[PDB]
Every structure is written in structure tokens, then in C-alpha cells.
Amino acid sequence: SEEPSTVIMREAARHGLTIVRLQPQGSRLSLTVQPADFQALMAWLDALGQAGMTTATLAVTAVAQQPGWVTVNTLVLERS
Amino acid sequence: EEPSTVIMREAARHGLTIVRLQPQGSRLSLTVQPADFQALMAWLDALGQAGMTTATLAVTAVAQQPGWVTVNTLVLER
Structure with missing residues (x-):
């Protein structure tokens, strides 16, 4: 279906990630x-999870x- | 409420040990x-809503x- 880059960039534009x-x-x-913003980063990761893309590694400080x-x-x- | 009370109550609400x-x-x-990563993130989001920010997180x-x-x-x- 959709290529990962399409989902990643659409959701990055929505949630404010560069x-x-x-x-x-x-x-x-x-x-x-x-x-x-950590709340926005979590909202973005949740949207990627809904599109079938799981988070394999995440480290934030x-x-x-x-x-x-x-x-x-x-x-x-x-990948989904 | 003391931070440990909120942290432990919310961890139990999200199935985290x-x-x-x-x-x-x-x-x-x-x-x-x-x-479960979705449950871990839901817990951290609930803690953030209670005024407790995530200062460091590293998961694999x-x-x-x-x-x-x-x-x-x-x-x-806190």
C-alpha cells in the first residue's frame, strides 16, 4: 500500500517534526x-504504529x- | 500526591511492572x-499530563x- 516515507513525512508535517x-x-x-516536543513525538509514533510501523529503538533525553x-x-x- | 503514588498507580493502569x-x-x-510499547507510551503520556516529564528513555x-x-x-x- 503506502510507502513508509509517505507516511513518515505526512505524519511529521502533522506533528511538527523535522x-x-x-x-x-x-x-x-x-x-x-x-x-x-515529547508529546508531539509520541503522537507521531502512535500514528506510525497505526500505519503498521512499530518502534524498534527509541532513545530520548x-x-x-x-x-x-x-x-x-x-x-x-x-517497515509495515 | 507524592510522585511515587502517581507513578505506581498509573503503571498499574497500563500493565507495567x-x-x-x-x-x-x-x-x-x-x-x-x-x-508492550503502546502501553509504555500511554503510561508516559498519562504521567506527562500529571506534570511528570520523561527526562530519559531508552528502549529496544x-x-x-x-x-x-x-x-x-x-x-x-517531577
């Missing part, structure tokens, strides 16, 4: 994302002086 | 057993169970 890099990682997808924001240290998704 | 909850001032370091998928993860690091901030 994609620095999207590249394959074996059969998975590695995403490099600019620092983000709060941004200094902005506790509700996080640096996305690692993000890897599985 | 806490095996260590260690205070570090305004930060709380947790050790959580492997979990469970091999052969893709919707599940191991919670390698979890630190919350």
Missing part, C-alpha cells in the same frame, strides 16, 4: 530527527531548560 | 520489566515480539 535524515538500516528505517522537549538520540522503525 | 523506583531529588530513576525491541520493548533506561522528572 527529519534531518531518513535512511535504511538493514530492513529497518533509521530516522534522525531534530529536538522535539530531555533538552536542558525545556523539560517537555527531548533530543531524539536514536529512532529506528520497522 | 516497576521493580525499582529510586528518588534522585526532582528526578526518579525507574527499572521496568519488558513491555524484543527480538521475535516487535510491538514489545525492553526498557533499558527510564528517568522521570
Whole structure:
């Protein structure tokens, strides 16, 4: 059905995420994302899960002086 | 309410098992057993709505169970 990049970018536009890099990682997808509002990042990951893309690795750390924001240290998704 | 009360009540509401909850001032370091990722995120969202932010999170998928993860690091901030 839809290619993963289409879903990822449509949902990134909806939830306010900036994609620095999207590249394959074996059969998975590695995403490099600019620092983000954690609530918006969770809403985006939930939308990707609804499109059949599970979160294989996620590591985030709060941004200094902005506790509700996080640096996305690692993000890897599985294809649908 | 004390942060541990909210954290433990909400973990039980989302089926998550806490095996260590260690205070570090305004930060709380947790050790959580492997979990359904959607439930883990729902718990963190409910904690955020109660004023407790996710300061550090590191998870990796469970091999052969893709919707599940191991919670390698979890630190919350009150």
C-alpha cells in the first residue's frame, strides 16, 4: 500500500517534526530527527504504529531548560 | 500526591511492572520489566499530563515480539 516515507513525512508535517535524515538500516528505517516536543513525538509514533510501523529503538533525553522537549538520540522503525 | 503514588498507580493502569523506583531529588530513576510499547507510551503520556516529564528513555525491541520493548533506561522528572 503506502510507502513508509509517505507516511513518515505526512505524519511529521502533522506533528511538527523535522527529519534531518531518513535512511535504511538493514530492513529497518533509521530516522534522525531534530529536538522535539515529547508529546508531539509520541503522537507521531502512535500514528506510525497505526500505519503498521512499530518502534524498534527509541532513545530520548530531555533538552536542558525545556523539560517537555527531548533530543531524539536514536529512532529506528520497522517497515509495515 | 507524592510522585511515587502517581507513578505506581498509573503503571498499574497500563500493565507495567516497576521493580525499582529510586528518588534522585526532582528526578526518579525507574527499572521496568519488558513491555508492550503502546502501553509504555500511554503510561508516559498519562504521567506527562500529571506534570511528570520523561527526562530519559531508552528502549529496544524484543527480538521475535516487535510491538514489545525492553526498557533499558527510564528517568522521570517531577
